[PDB]
Amino acid sequence: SVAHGLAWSYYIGYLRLILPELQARIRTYNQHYNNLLRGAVSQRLYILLPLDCGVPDNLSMADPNIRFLDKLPQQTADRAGIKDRVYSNSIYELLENGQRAGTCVLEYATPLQTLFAMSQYSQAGFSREDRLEQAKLFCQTLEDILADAPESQNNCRLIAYQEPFSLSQEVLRHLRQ
Amino acid sequence: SVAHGLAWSYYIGYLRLILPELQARIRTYNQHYNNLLRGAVSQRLYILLPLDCGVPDNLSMADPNIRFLDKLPQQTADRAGIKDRVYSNSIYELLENGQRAGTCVLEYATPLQTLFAMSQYSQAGFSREDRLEQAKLFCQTLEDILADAPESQNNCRLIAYQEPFSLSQEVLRHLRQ
Numbered sequence: 001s002v003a004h005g006l007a008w009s010y011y012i013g014y015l016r017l018i019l020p021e022l023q024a025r026i027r028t029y030n031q032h033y034n035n036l037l038r039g040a041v042s043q044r045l046y047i048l049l050p051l052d053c054g055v056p057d058n059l060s061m062a063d064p065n066i067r068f069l070d071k072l073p074q075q076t077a078d079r080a081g082i083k084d085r086v087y088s089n090s091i092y093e094l095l096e097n098g099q100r101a102g103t104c105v106l107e108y109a110t111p112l113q114t115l116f117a118m119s120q121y122s123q124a125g126f127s128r129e130d131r132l133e134q135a136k137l138f139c140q141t142l143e144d145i146l147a148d149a150p151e152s153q154n155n156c157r158l159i160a161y162q163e164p165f166s167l168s169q170e171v172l173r174h175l176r177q
Numbered sequence: 178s179v180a181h182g183l184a185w186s187y188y189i190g191y192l193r194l195i196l197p198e199l200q201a202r203i204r205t206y207n208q209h210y211n212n213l214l215r216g217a218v219s220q221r222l223y224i225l226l227p228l229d230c231g232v233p234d235n236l237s238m239a240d241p242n243i244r245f246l247d248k249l250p251q252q253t254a255d256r257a258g259i260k261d262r263v264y265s266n267s268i269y270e271l272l273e274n275g276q277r278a279g280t281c282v283l284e285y286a287t288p289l290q291t292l293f294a295m296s297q298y299s300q301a302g303f304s305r306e307d308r309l310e311q312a313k314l315f316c317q318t319l320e321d322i323l324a325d326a327p328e329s330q331n332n333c334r335l336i337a338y339q340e341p342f343s344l345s346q347e348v349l350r351h352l353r354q
């Protein structure tokens with residue numbers, strides 16, 4: 001299926017390449033700013049999986065309690081002819097009653113955006129019904145892959161959600177565990 | 178199918194975002210070094226499509242007449258929560274009898290690498306026969322998309338090839354047109 005390929009590709013072509021080097025980048029940033037307790041960036045990459053496929057580019061739009069703090073120092077790697085291909089990742093603070101309750105690297109799984117866009121292109125032969133079905137399958141497949149993945153054990157968290165409570169509280173729910 | 182999704186995703190999630198800004202980046206680099214004639218970087222992104230799905234990270238390995246010249250100045254854009262997500266691209270010189278015959282931005286379509294890797298993972302339920310079939314379908318679909326794509330008219334060239342003459346000569350064949 002479309003989702004099956006997208007999930008395997010997002011894993012092989014992205015997660016597999018950034019997750020083994022993420023914890024060393026996170027440890028470097030926390031040790032540079034002596035970040036302890038709530039101000040210490042979580043050791044895991046938090047991946048937003050909206051089932052509606054609505055992927056905005058600014059996280060401070062889906063929820064105001066998600067605020068950009070810093071960029072995680074870039075990772076570079078020679079990739080498919082691109083010398084020093086850059087892997088940029090953003091660190092966010094999660095607010096609760098105005099104060100910083102948690103700190104983590106956060107981003108959306110960009111294949112969910114593709115699925116929505118695909119449903120808008122006549123040439124794609126892909127319906128809105130296909131988009132919701134493939135969205136659920138993409139999440140389930142990514143979950144199945146990461147469950148067995150050696151690169152991505154204790155350094156990745158999937159956050160699947162359906163808008164009917166709070167995204168910030170949901171990230172914080174995972175962060176507090 | 179797996180290829181159909183991969184081609185639409187590579188287009189929507191990558192080509193659609195870098196191709197409208199590529200020619201301005203190319204024009205900036207050529208004007209910075211007063212590059213004219215053979216030393217002038219081609220206005221198109223050259224995408225390598227090996228039908229065997231063999232995607233190495235160093236182009237100077239598939240053919241020695243492909244030599245790294247410079248990095249095209251990075252493009253940055255806020256993308257799915259990643260602030261200033263970096264789009265790095267590499268400029269290559271194409272050699273003929275030791276001398277520079279052409280200059281172009283060159284890279285492999287990374288979804289072809291995913292397809293090969295997918296065929297190696299037992300959980301993917303994807304055979305070597307599926308990999309070759311999906312590889313051909315990925316190329317054909319990408320060609321179909323780019324043919325009608327408004328972002329990607331005169332600024333993208335697909336180079337599909339099957340190893341049985343010369344990759345460098347093949348890129349040069351397109352460059353000389």
Ligand SMILES: COc1cc2sc(C(=O)CCC(=O)O)cc2cc1/C=C\COc1cc2cc(C(=O)CCC(=O)O)sc2cc1OC
Pocket residue numbers: 006009010013014079082085110111114182183186187190191256262287288289291
């Ligand atoms: C959303 O879908 C894509 C997005 C990108 S972005 C990308 C490149 O930047 C080219 C170089 C590279 O692969 O690193 C290739 C792809 C390919 C696809 C197509 C299928 C999805 O599989 C991938 C996801 C994927 C996401 C990538 C990211 O960098 C995450 C951030 C973002 O998408 O902007 S790399 C990447 C590679 C994938 O397959 C090779």
